[PDB]
């Protein structure tokens, strides 16, 4: 019932919430890396096009 313990309790609850969100998403259909890689590489070639011109 102390502030230190009270603080610690609320903090861990929140960290489990952040995970809850990550997990809940993974199962649902998430990731967002696939596209990111394609955009990164393509953006690469854009820099190349910018340098050419």
């Amino acid at each position: 019932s102390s502030a230190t313990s009270a603080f610690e309790r609320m903090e861990n609850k929140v960290l489990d919430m952040e995970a809850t969100s990550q997990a809940a998403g993974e199962l649902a259909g998430f990731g967002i890396e696939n596209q990111f890689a394609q955009l990164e590489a393509s953006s690469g070639v854009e820099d190349e096009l910018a340098a050419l011109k």
Binding site: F7, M10, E11, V14, L15, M17, E18, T20, S21, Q22, A24, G25, L27, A28, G29, F30
Partner: protein, 53 residues
């Protein structure tokens, strides 16, 4: 001399306590933001997911 010796224990520990509280206060703010983020994210994973009728 006694007064200075005792006020020196007190100022050192005051300094220590001050810093420790301030650690907690700045963590309090970011932890609230983290909590909000988790809450929004879960709701969105549920809404967006097709795993529902």
């Amino acid at each position: 001399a006694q007064q200075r010796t005792m006020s020196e224990n007190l100022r050192r520990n005051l300094a220590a306590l001050e810093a420790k509280i301030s650690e907690a206060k700045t963590k309090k703010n970011m932890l609230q933001a983290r909590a909000k983020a988790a809450k929004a994210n879960a709701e969105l994973q549920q809404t967006l997911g097709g795993l529902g009728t």
